[PDB]
Amino acid sequence: LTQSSSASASLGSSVKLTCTLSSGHDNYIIAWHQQQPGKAPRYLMQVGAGGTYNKGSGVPHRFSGSSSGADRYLTISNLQSDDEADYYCETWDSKTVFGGGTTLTVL
Amino acid sequence: QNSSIGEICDSPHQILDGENCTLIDALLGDPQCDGFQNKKWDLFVERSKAYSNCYPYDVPDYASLRSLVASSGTLEFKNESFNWTGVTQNGTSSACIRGSSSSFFSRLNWLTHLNYTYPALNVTMPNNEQFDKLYIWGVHHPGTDKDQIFLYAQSSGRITVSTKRSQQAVIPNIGSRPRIRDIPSRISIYWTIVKPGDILLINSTGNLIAPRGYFKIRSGKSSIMRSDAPIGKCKSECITPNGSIPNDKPFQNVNRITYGACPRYVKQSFHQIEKEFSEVEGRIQDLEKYVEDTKIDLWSYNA
Amino acid sequence: QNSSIGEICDSPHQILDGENCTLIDALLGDPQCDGFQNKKWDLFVERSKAYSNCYPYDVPDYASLRSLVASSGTLEFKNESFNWTGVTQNGTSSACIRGSSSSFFSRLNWLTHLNYTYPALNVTMPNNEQFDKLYIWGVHHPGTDKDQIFLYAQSSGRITVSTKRSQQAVIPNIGSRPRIRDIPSRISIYWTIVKPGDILLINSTGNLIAPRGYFKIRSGKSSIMRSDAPIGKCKSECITPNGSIPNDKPFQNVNRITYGACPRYVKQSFHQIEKEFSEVEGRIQDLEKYVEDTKIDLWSYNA
Amino acid sequence: QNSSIGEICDSPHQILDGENCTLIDALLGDPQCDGFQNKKWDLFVERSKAYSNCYPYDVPDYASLRSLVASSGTLEFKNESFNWTGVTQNGTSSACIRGSSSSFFSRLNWLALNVTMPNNEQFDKLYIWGVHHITVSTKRSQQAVIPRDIPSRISIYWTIVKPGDILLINSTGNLIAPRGYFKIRSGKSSIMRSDAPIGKCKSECITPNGSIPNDKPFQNVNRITYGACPRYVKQSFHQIEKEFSEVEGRIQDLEKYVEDTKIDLWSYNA
Amino acid sequence: VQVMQSGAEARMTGATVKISCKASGYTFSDYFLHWVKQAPGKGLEWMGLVDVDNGEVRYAEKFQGRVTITADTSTETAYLEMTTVTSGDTAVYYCASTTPRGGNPSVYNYFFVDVWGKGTTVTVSS
Ligand SMILES: *[C@@H]1O[C@H](CO)[C@@H](O[C@@H]2O[C@H](CO)[C@@H](O[C@@H]3O[C@H](CO[C@H]4O[C@H](CO)[C@@H](O)[C@H](O)[C@@H]4O)[C@@H](O)[C@H](O[C@H]4O[C@H](CO)[C@@H](O)[C@H](O)[C@@H]4O[C@H]4O[C@H](CO)[C@@H](O)[C@H](O)[C@@H]4O[C@H]4O[C@H](CO)[C@@H](O)[C@H](O)[C@@H]4O)[C@@H]3O)[C@H](O)[C@H]2NC(C)=O)[C@H](O)[C@H]1NC(C)=O
Ligand SMILES: *[C@@H]1O[C@H](CO)[C@@H](O[C@@H]2O[C@H](CO)[C@@H](O[C@@H]3O[C@H](CO)[C@@H](O)[C@H](O)[C@@H]3O)[C@H](O)[C@H]2NC(C)=O)[C@H](O)[C@H]1NC(C)=O
Ligand SMILES: *[C@@H]1O[C@H](CO)[C@@H](O[C@@H]2O[C@H](CO)[C@@H](O[C@@H]3O[C@H](CO)[C@@H](O)[C@H](O)[C@@H]3O)[C@H](O)[C@H]2NC(C)=O)[C@H](O)[C@H]1NC(C)=O
Ligand SMILES: *[C@@H]1O[C@H](CO)[C@@H](O[C@@H]2O[C@H](CO)[C@@H](O)[C@H](O)[C@H]2NC(C)=O)[C@H](O)[C@H]1NC(C)=O
Ligand SMILES: *[C@@H]1O[C@H](CO)[C@@H](O[C@@H]2O[C@H](CO)[C@@H](O)[C@H](O)[C@H]2NC(C)=O)[C@H](O)[C@H]1NC(C)=O
Ligand SMILES: *[C@@H]1O[C@H](CO)[C@@H](O[C@@H]2O[C@H](CO)[C@@H](O)[C@H](O)[C@H]2NC(C)=O)[C@H](O)[C@H]1NC(C)=O
Ligand SMILES: *[C@@H]1O[C@H](CO)[C@@H](O[C@@H]2O[C@H](CO)[C@@H](O)[C@H](O)[C@H]2NC(C)=O)[C@H](O)[C@H]1NC(C)=O
Ligand SMILES: *[C@@H]1O[C@H](CO)[C@@H](O[C@@H]2O[C@H](CO)[C@@H](O)[C@H](O)[C@H]2NC(C)=O)[C@H](O)[C@H]1NC(C)=O
Ligand SMILES: *[C@@H]1O[C@H](CO)[C@@H](O[C@@H]2O[C@H](CO)[C@@H](O)[C@H](O)[C@H]2NC(C)=O)[C@H](O)[C@H]1NC(C)=O
Ligand SMILES: *[C@@H]1O[C@H](CO)[C@@H](O[C@@H]2O[C@H](CO)[C@@H](O)[C@H](O)[C@H]2NC(C)=O)[C@H](O)[C@H]1NC(C)=O
Ligand SMILES: *[C@@H]1O[C@H](CO)[C@@H](O[C@@H]2O[C@H](CO)[C@@H](O)[C@H](O)[C@H]2NC(C)=O)[C@H](O)[C@H]1NC(C)=O
Ligand SMILES: *[C@@H]1O[C@H](CO)[C@@H](O[C@@H]2O[C@H](CO)[C@@H](O)[C@H](O)[C@H]2NC(C)=O)[C@H](O)[C@H]1NC(C)=O
Ligand SMILES: *[C@@H]1O[C@H](CO)[C@@H](O[C@@H]2O[C@H](CO)[C@@H](O)[C@H](O)[C@H]2NC(C)=O)[C@H](O)[C@H]1NC(C)=O
Ligand SMILES: *[C@@H]1O[C@H](CO)[C@@H](O[C@@H]2O[C@H](CO)[C@@H](O)[C@H](O)[C@H]2NC(C)=O)[C@H](O)[C@H]1NC(C)=O
Ligand SMILES: *[C@@H]1O[C@H](CO)[C@@H](O[C@@H]2O[C@H](CO)[C@@H](O)[C@H](O)[C@H]2NC(C)=O)[C@H](O)[C@H]1NC(C)=O
Ligand SMILES: *[C@@H]1O[C@H](CO)[C@@H](O)[C@H](O)[C@H]1NC(C)=O
Ligand SMILES: *[C@@H]1O[C@H](CO)[C@@H](O)[C@H](O)[C@H]1NC(C)=O
Ligand SMILES: *[C@@H]1O[C@H](CO)[C@@H](O)[C@H](O)[C@H]1NC(C)=O
Ligand SMILES: *[C@@H]1O[C@H](CO)[C@@H](O)[C@H](O)[C@H]1NC(C)=O
Ligand SMILES: *[C@@H]1O[C@H](CO)[C@@H](O)[C@H](O)[C@H]1NC(C)=O
Ligand SMILES: *[C@@H]1O[C@H](CO)[C@@H](O)[C@H](O)[C@H]1NC(C)=O
Ligand SMILES: *[C@@H]1O[C@H](CO)[C@@H](O)[C@H](O)[C@H]1NC(C)=O
Ligand SMILES: *[C@@H]1O[C@H](CO)[C@@H](O)[C@H](O)[C@H]1NC(C)=O
C-alpha cells in the first residue's frame, strides 16, 4: 500500500525492498513489478501473507520474496552492472493501488 | 390403440415442458430457464434438443438424483440463513450470463476466500419442521492448482457433510478435463436428505459450492419424461413419447414408456423405471432392460 | 383370504424375537441383547421399537450386509488367535455400558495405541476349514484431530483388508458429526468373505477396529422380517407381519412380504427381497419396487 | 424337451471355443490365448477349468465389463499412435512368459502425463487401461483412481468414448496405459459357461448341457439359454447372469428374484 | 503471450486522442486489461480496468467521468479516448493483461496484472 524510499548498494552485494499495508489489512497479497527507465515494465513477483510467494512465467530465480506480518519484502540475491530500475507493488483488486515506486541505484 | 394424436395434451395431468432446459438444469437454477424457479408439475417433459449454458457440471450417480427430483414433482425452495461468516459469498461465473451480467446458479452459492483466508467452516442447520427436506450442494474441481490456490487459499481442499443418520465425504481432484464450452474445470453436484428432527452439519476446509436453502421433498405421483412431441390441448390422460393415447383398447403398440392408467404394451399388433438409454453402464442396465423384456413377453402371451 | 390370525406362531419355523436389537445390533454384540449371542433362527423378526445403545455406528451397503446375514440364519461364531501384539486391545466407551461398567461391542475389538505407539499391523489368517467363513471389521471416525492423536497417536490412518481374490481399502475421515447420544464420532462397519483355501490379510497403519473371530456362513433357508405382532403358538406355515396366515385359499391380501409355503398377494379384495422402505435412494429402489409391482400386477391378472 | 444332446455345435452361430481362456484374459491379450487376437464371435464359451496364466489382476465391476465385452462380440483392436514420450514403455514381469521370454499383456502397455486421443471416427469406441498397485477424463465424465507369487495386483478399468469426444489421460505414475481402442458394436453376441464338447450338429438352440432341439415348445434342461428357443418351466440374445459363485447382496438377490419370478410365471403359463 | 499497443501521434491542446491495445495470446478471451497513466517523473496511477469479455469497465476516483474507456469484444481489442486533452497529459498509458478467468468467480487474485504493454507516448503541443 504505502511506498518506500530509494535504495543503493555496491556491485556484488545484496539489497532489499519493502511495501507495507495499513492497519486495516494484514493478510492482503501484494505484487512486484519492475520498470526500467525508458522502458516498458515487466511483472516479476507476487507475495503472500504466510511467508510464501507465487511466481509468474519467466520470472527470474535471482529475486526472492518475504513477509513478516503487515509488510511485504523483496530481496535481490545479487545485483551487478546496469541492473537497477524502479519497483512497484499492487496491493488490491478493486483499485490497482500502487505505492509510488522505489528507485534503485548503483554506487 | 396403434396410433396416437401426436401431442402431449396438458389435461388433466399438469405438464411442465422444458423448451431448452433439462430438469436438473432447472433444479440447479440455470439463468437460461429462470422461469422454472419454484414451479410445480405432474409430468416433466424434456425435449431432446436441451442443452446446458451455465458452468459445465456433472452429477455423480445422475440417474437417482434425476429420478428423485422428478418424483418430487415440486421445485419449491426456501431460502435459509446459513452462517457463512469468514468467507465471501456470491461467486459469479462468466459462462452463466444472466441479464447481461456475469452470474451463477440461482440456487447455489460459490464461496471463495475472504481477506485471503478460508476458515474451516463448521455450520449447523437443524431441521425443526415436520417434513422431510432436501439439500443440494457441490464441489468445484479446478483445472489447475493455480485456479485452486487462487480460490481457496489452500491446495488441500476437502468436505464432509453429515447428518444424524449418515455422513458423506467428498475429495476434489485437480486436473484439466477435456474442454467443454471453453471451460476445463468441473462441478460435481450431490444431495443430502434431512428427515424431521435431523440435523445437517457442513464441515469443509475449502472448495465448497454451498446451498442457499432447502427444497421441499415430498412423496407424489409425478414422473419424468423425454420426448420431442408438441404440447396439445385435448383431454386424453395417457402420455407417450409419440403423443397421447386414449384407452380405447386394453393394449397398445405406440411405445413402452407411458404415464397414467394406460393400455399395456405387447409385441403383437405412474412413475416407472427408465426404458431407454444413451450409453452402456453395465449390469444394472442389463437387469433393467431384461425386466422390461420379460414383462413385454409375459403380456404378449397373456394377450 | 383377507384376514390375519394376529400372531407370529413359533412352529414349525424357528422364530427369533428381536425385542430390542436389530439384526445388525445382535450381530455386533450390543450389550443390551447379549442373549442373542450364537443363536440360530429360521426367521428374524425385528420390532418397530428397535433402538441402539452402544457407539453410534453406520454401515456402507447396510441393506446388502443385513440381507446376507439374515439369509445366513446362523450367529455361530468362533474366537480366533489374531496376533494383535504391539498394540493394546479392548477399547472401551462410555455409551456401551454392560452391568453399569464401561464396555464396547462384544464381537469387535477396538484397537488403540500402546505407550503412545501404534505399529503398522500386517496379520494373516488362512481359512483351512471346509466351509466358507465371514469376517466383520470396522474403522473409527474421531470427531477431532486431537481425538485421533489421543486414540492412535498417528494422524495418517489408513487400512486395507485383502484376500487371494481381491482387496478392500478405506480411508477414515477425521471430522465432526452431529452429537448423537453424546458422542461426536462415528464407526463404519465392513464385511469380508473368505472361501476355503483363501487367506485374509489385515493391513493397517492405524485406525482399525478388528474382528474377534469369524461367523459361519451357509445357504440358510431363513430370512428377515419387520413386524410388531406378538409371538403365538399355532402351527400354520406362512408368516406375515400382520400375523400368521393359513393356506385355505392360494390368493391373499394381508401383506406382500411373505415367507415359506404361502398363498400369493393379489390387489383384488423363502428369502425374498425387501419390499418396504423408509428412505429414498433412487434407481435401485425404483427397480426393485417396480419388479414387485410387475409381479403383483401379473398375479392379479391371473386371478 | 427333458434331455440334452450333450454337445455344442458351431452352426449357425459362430461359436468361439475358449478352451483355456476367460473372456477378459483374451481381451487383455494373454500370451496363452494369442489365438483369440482380433477375433469375432457369436457365443463365447468359458470352460470350468478356465484360468489366468500370468500376472494377477482384479477388475472392479467385473460383471459389467464382462457383459459389455461379451455383448460387443468383437475383439478388433487398433494400435493407436499414443504419445508416450518421457516414459519407459514395454514393462515386463516374470509371470507373463511368452515364447520362453519375459512378456506382458499384449493389449496393454506397462509404462505428469497429459495426453489426448480424440475419437475422429464415426463409431462409438472403447478403451481399457490399468492401474498398478491417475485420472482419465472424457467430455461426459471423469474417472479417478488412487493406487501367483506376486503380491502386487493390477486393476483394470475401461472408458467408452462417443464419436467426436476427447479421451484424456492425466497421471503421475502407476498407469498401465492402453495401446489402442476396441471397436465396440451392438450385436446379438453373448457369453456362456459350459464344458460341453464341440460337435457338428445344426440345431440352432444352445444350452450349457449341450444343444437343444427346437421342436418341443418348452424345455426343462437349464434356465440359461441363448437364441429364440424354448423356455424353462418347473414341471418335467443377451441377458443377466443366472449362476453365481459368490454372494454379493441386494443386487444379486434382485437378479435371482427376477429369474425366480419369471420361472414361477412361465411354469404357470404352460 | 504478447501485448502490444498502437503507435501514437502528436495532438494539439483541446483535441482528442485514441489508444488501442490487444493481447490475444490467452486462450479464453475472458481476461482483464488495465489502464495506467504515467507522466515522466511520476509514478504509476490507476485509471481503469476493462473486461474484454463483457461490458465491465472500471475507474479510479481521479479518472471517473472525465475519461471514457471502451473495448471491442468482437475483435478483442481495448480502446482509450479522452476529451479536451491538456498539455499536461503528455505521458505513457500502459495496458496490462491479467490472468484469464476461465469461468472462475473473479476473486481478489484474478485482477492482478502479469504482462505489460510495450508502451506508447502521447504528446500534446501548445
Ligand atoms: C492437458 O492437455 C490438454 C489437451 O492438450 C490441454 O487442454 C487444451 O488447452 C488448450 C490451451 O492450453 C486449448 O486450446 C485452446 O482451445 C480453445 C478451444 O478451441 C475449440 O473451440 C473453438 C470454438 O468453437 C474452435 O474454433 C476450435 O476448433 C476448438 O473446437 C480455442 O479457443 C483456442 O484457440 C485460440 O487461441 C489460440 C492462441 O494460441 C489461437 O491461435 C486461436 O486462433 C484461438 O484464438 C482465439 O480465441 C481466443 C480465446 O477465445 C482469443 O483470445 C483469441 O484472440 C482468438 O479469438 C479472437 O479471434 C477470433 C478470430 O478473429 C474471433 O472469432 C474471436 O472473437 C476473438 O476476437 C485454443 O486452441 C485446448 O482446446 C485444450 N484441449 C482440450 C482437449 O481440452 C490442457 O491445458 C493440458 N493441461 C495442462 C495443465 O497443461
Ligand atoms: C460444529 O458445530 C456444532 C454445532 O454448534 C457442534 O456440535 C455441538 O457440540 C457441542 C459440544 O459441547 C454439543 O453440546 C453438548 O451436547 C450434549 C447434548 O446431549 C450435552 O451432553 C452437553 O451439555 C453439550 O451441550 C452439542 O450438542 C453439539 N450440537 C449439535 C450436534 O447440534 C460441533 O462440535 C462443532 N464442531 C467442531 C469441530 O467444533
Ligand atoms: C505380511 O505378512 C504376510 C504373511 O506372513 C507376508 O506374506 C508372505 O510372505 C512370504 C515371504 O515373506 C511368502 O512366502 C513365499 O511364498 C511363495 C509361495 O508361492 C514361495 O515362492 C516362497 O517359498 C515363500 O514361502 C508368503 O507366501 C506370503 N504369504 C502369502 C499368503 O502369500 C507379507 O510379505 C507381509 N508383508 C510385509 C510388507 O512384510
Ligand atoms: C432454445 O435455444 C434455441 C437455440 O439453441 C433458440 O433458438 C433461437 O431463438 C432465437 C430467438 O430467441 C433466434 O434468433 C435464433 O435464430 C434461434 N436459433 C436457432 C439455431 O434456431 C430458442 O429460442 C430457445 N428457446 C427458448 C424457449 O428459449
Ligand atoms: C448474495 O446474494 C444474495 C442473493 O441476492 C443476497 O441475499 C439476498 O438479499 C436480499 C436483499 O436483502 C434479500 O431480499 C434476499 O432474500 C436475499 N436472498 C437470500 C437467498 O438470502 C445476499 O445478501 C448476498 N450476499 C452478499 C455477501 O453480498
Ligand atoms: C472440520 O472442521 C474443523 C474446524 O476446526 C477442522 O479442524 C481444523 O482443521 C485444520 C486443517 O486440518 C487444522 O489446521 C486445525 O487445527 C483444525 N482445528 C482444530 C480445532 O483442531 C477439520 O479439519 C474439518 N474437517 C473436515 C473434513 O473438513
Ligand atoms: C414412437 O416413437 C418411438 C421412438 O422414436 C419409435 O420407436 C423406434 O422405432 C424405430 C423404427 O422402427 C426403431 O428403429 C427404434 O429402435 C425404436 N425405438 C425404441 C426406443 O424402441 C416408434 O416406432 C414410434 N411409434 C409410432 C407408432 O410412431
Ligand atoms: C428393551 O427396551 C425397553 C424399552 O423399550 C427396556 O425397558 C426399560 O428398562 C429400563 C431398565 O433397563 C426401565 O427403567 C424402563 O422403565 C423400561 N422401559 C419400559 C418402557 O418398560 C428394556 O429393559 C430393554 N431390554 C433390554 C434387555 O435391554
Ligand atoms: C480383551 O478382552 C477379551 C474378552 O474378555 C479377552 O479375551 C478373553 O480371554 C480369556 C482368557 O484367556 C478367554 O477365556 C476368553 O475366551 C477371551 N475372550 C475373547 C472374546 O477373546 C482378552 O484377553 C482381553 N485382552 C486384553 C489385552 O486385555
Ligand atoms: C500395510 O502395512 C505395512 C506394514 O506391514 C505399511 O507399511 C508401513 O507404512 C508406514 C506408514 O506409511 C511406514 O512408516 C512404514 O515404514 C511402512 N513399513 C514398511 C515395512 O514399509 C503400509 O503402509 C500398510 N498399508 C496400508 C494401506 O495400510
Ligand atoms: C399389515 O400390516 C401392514 C404394515 O403395518 C399394513 O400396511 C399399512 O396399511 C395402512 C392402511 O392402508 C397404511 O396407512 C400404512 O402405511 C401401511 N403400513 C406400511 C408399513 O406400509 C397392512 O394394512 C396390514 N394388513 C392388514 C390386512 O391389515
Ligand atoms: C489348456 O491347459 C491345459 C492344462 O491346464 C493343457 O493341457 C496340458 O497340455 C500339456 C501340453 O501342452 C500336456 O503335457 C498336459 O498333459 C495337459 N494337461 C491336461 C490336464 O490335459 C492344454 O494343452 C491347454 N490348451 C491349450 C490350447 O493351450
Ligand atoms: C514396445 O514394444 C512394442 C511391441 O513390440 C513396439 O511396437 C511395435 O513396433 C513395431 C515396429 O514399428 C510395429 O511393427 C508393431 O506393430 C508395434 N506394436 C505395437 C503393439 O505397438 C514398440 O516400439 C516398443 N517400444 C519401445 C519404446 O521399445
Ligand atoms: C495431470 O497433469 C498435470 C500437468 O499436466 C499435473 O499437474 C501437476 O501437479 C503437480 C502436483 O500438484 C504440480 O506440482 C505441477 O506443477 C502440475 N503440473 C503442471 C504442468 O501444472 C497433474 O498432477 C496430473 N494429474 C495427476 C492426477 O497426476
Ligand atoms: C444341466 O446342467 C445343469 C448344471 O450342472 C444341471 O442343473 C442342476 O441340476 C441339479 C439336479 O437337478 C440341481 O440340483 C442343480 O441345482 C442344478 N444346477 C443349477 C445351477 O441350477 C441340470 O440338471 C443339467 N441337465 C441335464 C439334462 O443334464
Ligand atoms: C429467496 O431469495 C431469492 C434471491 O436469492 C429471492 O428472489 C426470493 O424472492 C427469495 N424468496 C422469497 C420467498 O422471498
Ligand atoms: C454465526 O457465526 C458467528 C461467528 O462464529 C457467531 O458469532 C454467530 O453467533 C453465529 N450465528 C448463528 C445464528 O449461529
Ligand atoms: C479483513 O479483516 C479486517 C479486520 O482484520 C476487517 O476490517 C476487514 O473488513 C476485512 N476485509 C473485508 C474485505 O471484509
Ligand atoms: C469365546 O470367548 C467367550 C468369552 O469371551 C467364551 O464364552 C466363548 O465360549 C468362546 N467361544 C469359543 C468358540 O471359544
Ligand atoms: C506376532 O506379531 C509379532 C509382532 O509383530 C511378531 O514378532 C510375531 O512373530 C508374530 N507371531 C506370529 C505367530 O505371527
Ligand atoms: C514406554 O515408553 C517409555 C518411554 O517413553 C519407556 O520408559 C517404557 O519402558 C515404555 N514401556 C513399554 C511397556 O513399552
Ligand atoms: C498392432 O501391432 C501388432 C504388433 O505388436 C500387430 O501384430 C498387429 O497386427 C497390429 N494391429 C493392427 C490392427 O494392425
Ligand atoms: C508428443 O509429445 C512430445 C513431447 O511433448 C511433443 O514434442 C510432440 O510434438 C508430441 N507429438 C504429438 C503427435 O502430439
Author numbering:
A (entry chain L): 4 to 9, 11 to 30, 36 to 59, 63 to 72, 74 to 80, 83 to 108, 114 to 127
B (entry chain A), C (entry chain B): 44 to 312, 392 to 425
D (entry chain C): 44 to 154, 163 to 184, 202 to 215, 224 to 312, 392 to 425
E (entry chain H): 2 to 9, 11 to 30, 35 to 59, 62 to 72, 74 to 111, 111A, 111B, 111C, ...
Report text from the authors:
Neutralizing antibodies target the hemagglutinin (HA), a trimeric protein containing “stem” (also known as the “stalk”) and “head” domains in each protomer. The head domain includes the Receptor Binding Site (RBS), making this domain the primary target of neutralizing antibodies by blocking virus attachment to host cells. The stem domain contains the fusion peptide, which is targeted by a smaller subset of neutralizing antibodies that prevent membrane fusion. Other designs, such as centralized conserved and computationally optimized broadly reactive antigen (COBRA) HA proteins, retain the subtype-specific structural architecture in both domains while seeking to accentuate the conserved features common to circulating strains.
A similar array of electrostatic interactions can be observed for #1664 in the RBS, with the R110 in CDR loop 3 hydrogen bonding with the backbone of HA T135, the backbone of G111a interacting with S136, N111b interacting with both Y98 and the backbone of D190, and D36 in CDR loop 1 interacting with S137. A substantial portion of the interface within the RBS is formed by hydrophobic packing of residues in CDR loop 3, with G111a located in close proximity to I226, and P111c to W153 and L194. Along the edge of the RBS, F30 in CDR loop 1 packs near P227 and could potentially engage with R222 by cation-pi interactions, while the backbone of T29 forms a hydrogen bond with the same residue. In #1664, this hydrophobic characteristic is also very prominent with Y37 and I38, likewise accommodating Y159. In addition, the N36 of #1664 is able to form hydrogen bond contacts with T160. By comparison, the heavy chain of #1664 contains fewer points of direct contact outside the RBS, with the most notable regions being Y112b and F114 supporting a hydrophobic cleft for Y159. Intriguingly, E85 and other residues in the heavy chain, such as the backbone of S26 and Y28, also appear to form electrostatic interactions with the glycan tree of N165 in the neighboring HA protomer. Residue 159 is also impactful in these interactions and seems to be the most important residue for influencing binding by #1664. With #1664, the 190-helix appears to play a minor role in determining affinity. The space is generally open around this helix, which allows accommodation of a range of residues, particularly at positions 192 and 193.
